[PDB]
Structure 1
Amino acid sequence: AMKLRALEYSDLLFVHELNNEYSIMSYWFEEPYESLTELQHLFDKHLLDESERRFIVEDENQVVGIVELVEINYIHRNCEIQIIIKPEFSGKGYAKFAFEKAIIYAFNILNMHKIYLYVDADNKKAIHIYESQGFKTEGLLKEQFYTKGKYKDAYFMSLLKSEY
């Protein structure tokens, strides 16, 4: 049994660890540096931010990951989606479930018209996970991000509600 539940202050500890792991943040072009105090101040800052919906992917025993619908625009009705499953719990398909539930939330609850995401071109794993759900590559932004000491190309992929 797996579920998605709103992010809570009490969970920031977990979110702290993830945000300070190099391997995880790198694949998503993030910086693996964030004090718990800064994370808590950011949680408080965006407490009423209706452009974001940060969730927690939880299995039958503990929290396993995070999934975020960010840049939620209510005029164009689209939003970016980000998924991060801790490598400790990779091996059990949590990413696909979290992705499906996040898509269902964005379309059926937030009434979004389109979802999009940026994925490292070399991250064929996540690329295939996304393609399985109906996401189609719409762009190839070359040298759009800098990580591991090099500029990396990123696929801009997306999915329309009409296609879902």
Structure 2
Amino acid sequence: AMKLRALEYSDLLFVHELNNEYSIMSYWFEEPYESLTELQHLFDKHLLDESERRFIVEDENQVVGIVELVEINYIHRNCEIQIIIKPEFSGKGYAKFAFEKAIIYAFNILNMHKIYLYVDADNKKAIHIYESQGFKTEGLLKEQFYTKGKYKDAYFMSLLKSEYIL
């Protein structure tokens, strides 16, 4: 029995071990450097930030990953989605379940009108999952990011509520 659960201070430990993994942050276009103190400080800082919602993906036993609906805009009604499953629990389908849960949350609870995301052009697995869920590649930002010593392009993908209610 899996579930997405509001991120907690106590969970930051896991997230820390998740945010300092080069392999993971590279695909996320992030940096693999974030002291636990910095993570706790940002958690306290954005505690009441209504432009964010950070969920923890947990199965029947342990926490397996994290999802995040960030940059939530309540005028344009859109937000960015981003998932990170621990490499140890990869392949179990956690990513797809958590992605579906997050889309449902954004469309049926936050009353969003459009979800979007940034993915690496070479990361065909994530693009495959997204296109399976409904996201369409709306843009190719060439050399938009810089990771592993290379300027990487990125697909700006997105999914409209009108295309999900159908």
Question: Shorter-chain TM-score category?
Answer: over 0.9
Partners of 1:134 and 1:16 lie apart in 2 by 30
Which string of whole-angstrom CA distances, capped at 9 and with x for unpartnered residues, describes residues 104-132 of structure 1? 00000000000000000000000000000
Partners of 2:85 and 2:40 lie apart in 1 by 21
Partners of 1:54 and 1:137 lie apart in 2 by 24
Superposition deviation, residue 32 in structure 1: 0.3
**What RMSD in Å do the two structures reach over aligned CA positions?**
0.4
Equivalent residues, number: 164
Gapped runs of 5+ residues in structure 2? none
Which string of whole-angstrom CA distances, capped at 9 and with x for unpartnered residues, describes residues 130-151 of structure 1? 0001110000000000000000
Partners of 2:33 and 2:134 lie apart in 1 by 33
Superposition deviation, residue 21 in structure 1: 0.2
Partners of 2:159 and 2:91 lie apart in 1 by 25
Partners of 1:140 and 1:55 lie apart in 2 by 28
Aligned to 2:18, the other structure's residue is in SS state: helix
Superposition deviation, residue 91 in structure 1: 1.6
Which string of whole-angstrom CA distances, capped at 9 and with x for unpartnered residues, describes residues 47-91 of structure 1? 000000000000111000000000000000000000000000002
Partners of 1:117 and 1:145 lie apart in 2 by 14
Aligned to 1:138, the other structure's residue is in SS state: strand
Gapped runs of 5+ residues in structure 1? none
Partners of 1:106 and 1:90 lie apart in 2 by 24
Provide TM-score, normalisation by structure 2.
0.98
Superposition deviation, residue 160 in structure 1: 0.2
Partners of 1:91 and 1:159 lie apart in 2 by 24
